[PDB]
Enzyme design. Structure first.
Site, PDB file in Angstrom:
ATOM      1  N   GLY A  52     -55.349  58.018  25.714  1.00  0.00           N
ATOM      2  CA  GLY A  52     -55.402  57.753  26.874  1.00  0.00           C
ATOM      3  C   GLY A  52     -54.662  58.653  27.767  1.00  0.00           C
ATOM      4  O   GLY A  52     -53.476  58.908  27.482  1.00  0.00           O
ATOM      5  N   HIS A  56     -61.851  57.161  25.950  1.00  0.00           N
ATOM      6  CA  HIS A  56     -60.279  56.948  25.468  1.00  0.00           C
ATOM      7  C   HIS A  56     -59.887  55.761  25.760  1.00  0.00           C
ATOM      8  O   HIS A  56     -60.416  54.704  26.681  1.00  0.00           O
ATOM      9  CB  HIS A  56     -59.499  58.211  26.207  1.00  0.00           C
ATOM     10  CG  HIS A  56     -59.103  57.467  27.587  1.00  0.00           C
ATOM     11  ND1 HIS A  56     -57.928  56.597  27.787  1.00  0.00           N
ATOM     12  CD2 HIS A  56     -59.427  57.619  28.924  1.00  0.00           C
ATOM     13  CE1 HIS A  56     -58.071  56.155  29.000  1.00  0.00           C
ATOM     14  NE2 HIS A  56     -59.153  56.767  29.874  1.00  0.00           N
ATOM     15  N   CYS A  57     -58.846  55.156  25.178  1.00  0.00           N
ATOM     16  CA  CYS A  57     -58.139  53.894  25.197  1.00  0.00           C
ATOM     17  C   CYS A  57     -56.631  54.346  25.243  1.00  0.00           C
ATOM     18  O   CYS A  57     -56.515  55.263  25.857  1.00  0.00           O
ATOM     19  CB  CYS A  57     -58.761  52.878  24.154  1.00  0.00           C
ATOM     20  SG  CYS A  57     -58.531  53.402  22.545  1.00  0.00           S
ATOM     21  N   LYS A  58     -55.870  53.620  24.684  1.00  0.00           N
ATOM     22  CA  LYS A  58     -54.523  53.879  24.613  1.00  0.00           C
ATOM     23  C   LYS A  58     -54.314  54.881  23.390  1.00  0.00           C
ATOM     24  O   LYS A  58     -53.981  56.272  23.777  1.00  0.00           O
ATOM     25  CB  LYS A  58     -53.753  52.780  24.258  1.00  0.00           C
ATOM     26  CG  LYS A  58     -52.117  53.328  23.990  1.00  0.00           C
ATOM     27  CD  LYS A  58     -51.377  51.777  23.907  1.00  0.00           C
ATOM     28  CE  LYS A  58     -50.066  52.190  22.852  1.00  0.00           C
ATOM     29  NZ  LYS A  58     -49.523  50.841  22.733  1.00  0.00           N
TER      30      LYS A  58
END
Length: 338
Positions: A188, A272-274
């Site tokens: 992220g 994306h995420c974290k």
């Protein structure tokens, strides 16, 4: 855990695989080599593999190189591994990959050969904390590598090693192509960079260039809102926020939106995420089961080989459960377009 459990397995007429619990004896016409300390897995928590594509590709190069050298053409090449059960699973994983990719063996045949000596390989664990609720085996990894070949996910004729190693580093963006020319996963991006020490929080700017040159036209964010969507869209990127609880599973509404955005994007998609592992890996695995009709285990395997650490905890159960349903969704999908 005893040099009694030693085992030698033939791979080819010149190549051998050995699990030694002692000192490899030598011979003038036998060459021994180990990768236990050369291609090591960088673990998150209790996970211990499988090795990523780069290391798999490096291994295949070392084998081809050793089989070609004029100094050893009259010698048997022995790839040995030690007493660490986790190292054995990886070394076994690599020989299996070599048989599938370069030899023309099937996943089942490569697996047969690997367990011929009755060796008991421990299966690959997830990256979560605590007990594992799902395991992927060597055979699950061989089927994944096989299909990656058939569908163009893996091509060691064009694979760029320096590019793969450059961009997985946190300081370059911690990113990985999951499906070449179609899916990238990345950490992220944080609003306002901090590429200086202890941190490697990247702003959307260090991604825009690379993204444009590799035709990324869409960006999905599963993370919470750390930057304003504007910073990406302002560069011609179509953005979407399919937000849902970190470390949790997606609702079907979300899975369907994701597949919809994907099934309609006009180029590659960057997700994306974290950490760009768990939530990210989970949704991309979804698109792959629906469109390539691969099992949850084969998919999770492929995804973890590209991006170690992907799909964690209850995420694995979700994929395992949703499999039958995504398989049929894709069935109907493929036919509607016909």
């Amino acid at each position: 855990r005893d040099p009694q459990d030693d085992v030698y397995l033939d791979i080819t007429d010149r190549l051998c695989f050995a699990i030694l619990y002692s000192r490899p004896k030598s011979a003038s016409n036998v060459h021994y080599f180990s990768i236990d300390n050369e291609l090591e897995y960088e673990n998150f928590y209790a996970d211990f593999g499988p090795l990523n594509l780069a290391m798999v590709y490096r291994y295949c190069c070392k084998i081809n190189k050793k089989l070609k050298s004029i100094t050893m053409l009259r010698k048997k090449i022995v790839h040995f591994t030690g007493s660490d059960q986790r190292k054995q699973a990886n070394a076994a994983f690599l020989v299996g990959c070599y048989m599938v990719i370069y030899l023309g063996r099937t996943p089942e045949e490569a697996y047969r050969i690997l367990i011929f000596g009755e060796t008991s390989y421990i299966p690959f664990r997830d990256a979560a904390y605590g007990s594992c609720n799902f395991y992927i085996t060597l055979l699950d990894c061989f089927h994944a590598v096989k299909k990656a070949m058939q569908y163009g996910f893996l091509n060691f004729n064009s694979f760029n090693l320096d590019e793969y190693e450059h961009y997985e580093k946190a300081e370059n963006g911690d990113l990985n192509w999951i499906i070449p020319d179609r899916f990238i996963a990345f950490c992220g991006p944080h609003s306002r960079a901090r590429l200086e020490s202890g941190y490697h929080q990247h702003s959307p700017e260090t991604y825009i260039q690379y993204f444009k040159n590799h035709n990324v036209t869409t960006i999905i964010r599963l993370n919470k809102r750390m930057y304003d969507a504007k910073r990406f869209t302002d560069a011609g990127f179509d953005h979407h926020d399919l937000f849902f609880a970190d470390g949790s599973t997606p609702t079907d509404a979300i899975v369907k939106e994701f597949l919809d955005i994907c099934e309609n994007a006009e180029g590659a998609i960057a997700v994306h995420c974290k950490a760009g592992l768990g939530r990210t890996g989970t949704l991309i695995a979804c698109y792959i089961m629906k469109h390539y009709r691969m099992t949850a285990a084969e998919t999770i395997a492929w995804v973890r080989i590209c991006r170690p650490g992907s799909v964690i905890g209850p995420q694995q159960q979700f994929l395992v459960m949703k499999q039958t349903n995504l398989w049929l969704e894709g069935d109907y999908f493929r036919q509607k377009l016909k």
